[PDB]
Design a protein around this ligand. Structure first.
Ligand SMILES: [Mg+2]
Ligand SMILES: [Mg+2]
Lengths: 241, 241, 241, 257, 257, 257
């Protein structure tokens, strides 16, 4: 659930350090030498988003503070790991999401920009919003609201707008946009309810509702609300009974 | 218009340096210590495209020379900033495009590869074409012709081909291609007239005309000309009266 | 064919070193000082995928070993170069694919992760799978089976799944997915036969057959088998006689 | 309390960031964002000693662990800063030692290797001993024993071997060696007692006592014990004079006959 | 005109790029693409002194501003190159000093800190003073005064303190210190007049005049004034001989009795 | 056979990786993955000497080419490691010299520049001569001739000029100069024969023979020939004593009268 997640990854790292000496020091530095998930995650995120403007060493303190303050940030990471492990047939190890999956890195990094944005650090948040778009190819406005148990499989090209809401247990694939229309401010982005699965390349535009457990077809363009448990596909999207 | 743009950014940088000490030196080095937009832009672009093969320090001289020679390159950057400020509801600061928006960085970087390509420096231009695809996820052939007041919102996945033409005040989103068909050379890429807005994921193929102020739907595949002021949507794209 | 490819690139590098002194040392270090394609390719790949966790110098030995062991890895690179030269109207030089095209870099890098994956080095392969998604925006599961004469033009956003098969002489563009459905393991990814051309943004889902020499339309969503020599387009994809 | 020292630095830091925009983020990230000398110090040293083999971010954890086990390592740095501010006429700010003086950085970095040496991490301690010699040009064996209120002015070229001992309040200049003799292990390096000042280039060799409050002339070669309050000079060094009033480490009087 | 010097370098550069393909882009980016010594020099120094705190690209602007305000800083480098080409038998090319000799880089880098020191940018000047000691192993206080036609051969270990003065045409070798004495500010460092050559390892301490055309023996310790055309040697140094014909900085005659 | 030396290192390496997880990948990448000293050495040196101008990956090819043409360069390193393990009481592991001692790295790096110097690649050799002085603080002209079984303990500050010759089994400490004299090319640097040990800071200047098995006292200044088995000390150096039994390079006896 949480303690299980970190111990599954802890036990795995030991074995993978033995099988691949070239990464032994990486497994030790990232996983094996820390006492909890936050230690591994702040380390990995700091390194992936580093830049001389804001070096890993500086970034890590900012990340740790965030974790110390709102610990739930780490619980959500634990749940996201479990989601990928449970919904992605290609994933066979608990440590894989944590170490190599840019979609998962993008999500946890967004949790940091979301935290900064709500701590009155808009500049640093926009600066990291871009770092995240660059390092992971995922662009999430810091003010978007995203829950836990979320999976961004492959992730390249995902874009989530300012007023977006993604509830728990949502899965999103490469090239999917949750964007808006109009040159005005206010609610103009999608509300994706829990359990929703979005196919690769789908574009959901406007402040529209995406019912829970709905399935959105690859390359579908959703412009109108999608009932709960329904399947929308096509351009524009239609409900396929 | 131009002098207003740089002074809006100059005044903003001072305030953001006060609110975020961690980036104070970044605001000063990039914006506050230079006398004009070109000083800030050449600095930022050099750093974002740096690589040991061609370091920021070396790149910057090449960029500055370009600016010195054809100053309009900087005016166009000023107009692009204003475009984003005016068409993107998420943007609230004039400095945001300049500092963090990879789409805007991609555009101005392309202006440099376009300049190099027309100075008989094809190698360096192809080398930077790739740097730009890597750093910003935007691939623009150096020979494409692009005007000013252009916005690449989010930008991940945009591709513009060799014979493409994009006129002024055009807005393009993530995943959009202006590509061609055929294994032959010659005109084989889109001509997008002024004011045109292209939705996320749209693919416009061939040497076809995209009338002014037309609107192209997300994920639309345009294979035939689109009349001025019209709206094309669907796969293939159809005119929605 | 093979010896011709490396000599076309060798002769070109000399001329481009003369025309662009700023890259002279790059042409010499990458091309002119090595005796064969593997020398240039291992050098370039090591540098593009470097990271302190696994530096270029360390990566290069791993790459060289791979080449020494299975030399065909380099022949396939030679064929891929020729494919781009022959199918991409924008390419005018044999060295261009080798030096600047991220799609081609992604393919050859995948050949290394495929080799590592079959040498019982799953960790290192997943680590490089992510490096490749980051450096080139292309995500290829290491167990995918890909032949030679392959072209990933532009490439941003391409995703190839675990059980995928891509035969020879296949061309794939930006945003295309060869993905799967279901949370189960087993064959769940596309089988693209030889000669197949896939348009930008196409999403091919499931363990389905894509007949040889078929043409897939941009943004097409293929969910059912496509006969040989046929053209599929639309969402879902339909056969356009 | 070593907080006064830190108070001075934090105070300088705010005004320094105000005057030099180009170093603002550096002052805030090293000094101002931290509430004690330990956070500044670990940050700085980890950055100066960084290498892909052991990156700044990794090394910093190792240093904070050492400060957690041995807080006195931080207080020792405070005093070392106080020693420089008082004895080095060139140093007017309390922040200068901390931010820029490589002899200071070296001594503090050594304290970290000294800690690892006895944590059963000798490979890492040797790795860092070398990182220190390369980064600051100072080679201090991790098993050496060094007190506090120590100044290594300029520092380039300083060598301090395995069995060396250096007590509190000693001033050492560039080029100085506290070297061993022989090809066997065991006590074979100098024991420099408090208040001793050693001039530039001086070489002290073997297991010999350098008397408290003694003064070692520049470029001398000391091979025999030196009496307290005595001044040794020459190649080889000879006891040329004696002052029982002087305080060589604090006076920094370089003249001798 | 210091263009002759530059003409020689540019001429060597074209042929050097021709012979060593691996360094071509380095020769073009530093030398050939620039039309004067200033562009080459700022490029090189900014690269050698670079750090995430102050990256090459940022530092270079700071250097070009200094060259714009004080063009003589560039002409001083030309002469320093001429001094090495003439006095160092090991140096056959005019481009060698500029491209590779760390003592040269140090002196030029110091001139930049000297300029910042009086631009009200002492924090940056101290930051760089340290960057210089770390990059080239040479520690020159920014307030020191140094003329032109100066050679720091090998240079590792050279220290020049705050109130030091060095006139034109002086040759200084590795390990040399122009050091202070005392714990108080004020004139307390050596004043080395033209044509003086100082052998490796020599330590000159206090506010003392080192006579024009004098010759300082290696490893000596100078604590009293040295007469013009005199040769001082020993620990402590003694005036052992005098030659009124010699030109120590140019002859580089290291022998003494 | 220099494989015994390598066997020791590989053996230490496995257990070292076992004890210090944080350095595991470093031990495997440098030592364990390679089957001979050449692969470890080229890897390490290329990494220590790396610069965007000549990156580790490029430089390494240049080094492997040198080892392919001149395998004895590797065997020379084996012996240099053996020399340190035997003479330096501080060094207990055979892997220490190889992994961490900058004087060792310098000597091996020089051997590469010496090879390039006569491959018609003098620009690259000078580029590296400087990379070596900056990375390890040791300046060895590429045209210098150095034997094997050589130890540069601590090494900071060592300078060895163009025409210098150093035979087998010599021990040299930090601050030592084998320097030239005069402003003309030609033989003008020391010739140090086997078994000679040179104390810290010593300066040997001009084309003079330093007799086999001789012992040079720390901080001495040698300007005249030194007889075999003789001990020279002082500024200027004088022959103070003679031992025909001693073996200075191996004994490392630093005391003198
Ligand atoms: Mg990317
Ligand atoms: Mg150094």
């Amino acid at each position: 659930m949480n303690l299980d997640v970190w111990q599954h990854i802890r036990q795995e790292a030991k074995e993978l350090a033995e099988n691949e000496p070239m990464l032994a020091s990486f497994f030790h530095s990232t996983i094996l030498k820390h006492q909890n998930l936050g230690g591994a995650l702040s380390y990995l995120l700091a390194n992936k988003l580093a830049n001389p403007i804001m070096p890993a060493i500086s970034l890590r303190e900012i990340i740790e503070e965030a974790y110390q303050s709102n610990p739930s940030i780490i619980d959500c990471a634990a749940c996201d790991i479990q989601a990928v492990r449970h919904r992605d047939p290609a994933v066979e190890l608990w440590s894989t999401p944590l170490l190599y999956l840019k979609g998962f890195h993008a999500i946890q990094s967004y949790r940091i920009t979301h935290y900064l944005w709500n701590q009155n650090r808009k500049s640093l948040a926009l600066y990291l919003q871009n770092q995240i778009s660059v390092a992971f190819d995922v662009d999430i406005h810091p003010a978007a609201k995203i829950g836990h148990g979320i999976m961004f499989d492959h992730a390249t090209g995902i874009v989530v707008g300012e007023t977006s809401v993604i509830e728990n247990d949502v899965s999103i694939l490469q090239g999917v946009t949750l964007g808006g229309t109009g040159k005005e401010s206010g609610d103009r982005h999608p509300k994706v309810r829990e359990g929703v699965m979005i196919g690769a390349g789908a574009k959901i535009l406007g402040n529209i509702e995406v019912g829970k457990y709905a399935k959105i077809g690859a390359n579908s363009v959703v412009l109108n609300p999608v009932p709960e448990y329904a399947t929308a596909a096509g351009v524009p999207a239609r409900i396929v009974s």
